[PDB]
């Protein structure tokens, strides 16, 4: 019913307005999208493109950028940072 994000990810979620430490999958996804939207990490022209270099999100993902259209790297980071 819920997962616990490891610290690095929990800080990012909190910065997007998340409260607590236990969340559902969709909850994690919601705050993560709000983090990206708020900090405007996506490109204005190609909005599926997210540049995270120089942001803690990029340090956690192990990448300077990713595409929401090919989420594999995103899901790989979540499997490594979410505990059931």
């Amino acid at each position: 019913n819920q997962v616990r994000p490891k610290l690095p990810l929990l800080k990012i979620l909190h910065a997007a307005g998340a409260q607590g430490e236990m969340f559902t999958v969709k909850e994690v996804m919601h705050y993560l999208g709000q983090y990206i939207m708020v900090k405007q990490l996506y490109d204005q022209q190609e909005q599926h493109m997210v540049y995270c270099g120089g942001d803690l999100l990029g340090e956690l993902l192990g990448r300077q950028s990713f595409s929401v259209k090919d989420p594999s790297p995103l899901y790989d980071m979540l499997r490594k940072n979410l505990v059931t």
Binding site: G33, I36, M37
Partner: peptide, 12 residues
Amino acid sequence: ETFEHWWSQLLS
């Protein structure tokens, strides 16, 4: 599409 459109449909 917009960022919201793409993101809201991850895992769908």
